[PDB]
Structure formats: C-alpha cells, structure tokens
Amino acid sequence: GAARIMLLERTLQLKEEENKRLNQRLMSQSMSSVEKIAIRDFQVGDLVLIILDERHDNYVLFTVSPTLYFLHSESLPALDLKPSRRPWVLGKVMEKEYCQAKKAQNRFKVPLGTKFYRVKAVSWNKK
Amino acid sequence: GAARIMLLERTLQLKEEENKRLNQRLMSQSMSSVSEKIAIRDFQVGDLVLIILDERHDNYVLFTVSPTLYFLHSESLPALDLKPRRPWVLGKVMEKEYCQAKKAQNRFKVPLGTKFYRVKAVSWNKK
C-alpha cells in the first residue's frame, strides 16, 4: 500500500514535469514558426533562373541536375520573351508537369524516350 | 488508504489526459507546419554562389544580375579545381574585398576607375 502511494506520487510528479516540458515546447514551436534562387528540388513559388538553351531550342530552368526542366510555350510570351533573343531572365515557378518525348523528332531536341519536366512560370520582380 | 490510492489514480489519469491532449495539439501544429539556395544579388559571407567563366574579362565571376562585378580571387581559383577549364561550378563565399581599377591596363579588363569586388570562395560539396 505504502509502495503504491509512493509510486503513484512519483509517477504523478513525472507526469507533471512532462506537462511543463510539453507546454513549454508548444510555446517555443509557436514562437519559432516565423531573394535566393532554388537550384535542386523545384517547388511552386520557388525563384528560378530561366536561361536560353540552343542545343535544345528552348529555354530551360537552371538546374545542376541531369533532369531537364523546360519552359512552357504559353509561359514564354507572358514575360516579354520573343518566340536571336535574350540570354536569361528570372522567374517564379508556378506549376510543373512530368513529360516524356514520345517521338524521336521533337522540338526539345532530346533523344527518344527522354523524360523531363515542363514548367509554367511567371516573372518575378524585386519587392 | 484505498481512497487515497484511487484519488491519486484519478489525478494521474487527469494529468496524463492533459499531457496527451497537448501532444495531439503538438502533432496537429507540426502537421499544419510547412513541409539549398544560391545568392544572386548582395553577397555576404557564407552564401552559395555560382562561379561561371566570363569571356570579356579574363576571369571567373559570381553570377550576378546586378551592375556591380564580383570577380573570383586569383589565389582562390586553383583551390576549387579551376585552372587559371570547367565552364561553371558553385561554391561558398568566404571573403569579399571592395577594389577599384587604378590602371587602364588592368587584368580584369575593366575601364579605368571601375569599382568592383574580389571574392575568395571555396568549393561546395553536397552531402
């Protein structure tokens, strides 16, 4: 009986310490929740550098990766890009689509069966 | 002391329920929570930059879409396996110095009186 009461008081103190620790952790996590370009894993809202590729006749997002990210045909004219012309521009990625070259003679100048991304992006100016 | 033991069991049960509710709140907060980068404009020490070869000026330059020119340091060049012929590589900036072209026959091929930066940076390897 005495052992049960002592154990219950000890575990109750342990639970109280846990309650203080968890409440303080919650307050700290709520406290800590609050111009650079993305290079690798592309997500919507990321800042990217669109450069002109000539080997493939298109504009491609700067990528330090084997996968090729091309710019979408509808996204080209929106940022005053003419269908030679400008070497690079800065933008913000809005949507990405996984595509594959089903035809050997394509506009992307990629070999047959190559999988790549097509990105719809909009220009991004400083704020 | 059965009454005392039961009182302690109830109080312990209440405290553990409070702790579990706080833990569920923490998990909900963590789930509501969201989920490298290159510096292009104003470089400060420790930023990841993209060193590319410039052809007009016989040097490697940090990519900048800004009027000021950031050159790579002559001594830092061989450290990141660039010989004074990779096209580009990315590194981490370690120190910058504000300089001005005092002679018309300078190595940077900048006009007389041009102000620029010289940055010593080190290669960057991803884990």
Curated annotation (Swiss-Prot), chain B:
Subcellular location: Nucleus; Cytoplasm; Cytoplasm, Cytosol; Preautophagosomal structure
Domain of life: Eukaryota
Expression sites (tissue/organ): Expression levels correlated closely with those of RB1 in cancer cell lines as well as in various normal human tissues. Abundantly expressed in human musculoskeletal and cultured osteosarcoma cells.
Membrane spanning stretches: none
Residues with PTM Phosphoserine: 30
Task performed by this protein: Involved in autophagy. Regulates early events but also late events of autophagosome formation through direct interaction with Atg16L1. Required for the formation of the autophagosome-like double-membrane structure that surrounds the Salmonella-containing vacuole (SCV) during S.typhimurium infection and subsequent xenophagy. Involved in repair of DNA damage caused by ionizing radiation, which subsequently improves cell survival by decreasing apoptosis. Inhibits PTK2/FAK1 and PTK2B/PYK2 kinase activity, affecting their downstream signaling pathways.
Remaining remarks: Probably involved in the tumorigenesis of breast cancer. RB1CC1 is frequently mutated in breast cancer and shows characteristics of a classical tumor suppressor gene.
Quaternary assembly: Part of a complex consisting of ATG13/KIAA0652, ULK1 and RB1CC1. This complex associates with ATG101. Interacts with PTK2/FAK1 and PTK2B/PYK2. Interacts with GABARAP and GABARAPL1. Interacts with ATG16L1; the interaction is required for ULK1 complex-dependent autophagy. Interacts with RNF111, SKI and SMAD7. Interacts with COP1 in the cytoplasm of proliferating cells in response to UV stimulation. Interacts with TP53. Interacts with C9orf72. Interacts with WDR45B. Interacts with ATG13; this interaction is increased in the absence of TMEM39A. Interacts with WIPI2. Interacts with TAX1BP1.
Domain note: The FFAT motif is involved in the interaction with MOSPD2, VAPA and VAPB and its phosphorylation regulates these interactions.
Family of the protein in this entry: Belongs to the ATG17 family.
Stated name of the protein: RB1-inducible coiled-coil protein 1
Organism of this sequence: Homo sapiens (Human)
Lineage of producing organism: Eukaryota, Metazoa, Chordata, Craniata, Vertebrata
Gene, per the UniProt record: RB1CC1
Residue numbers of the full-length protein present here: 1458 to 1593 of 1594
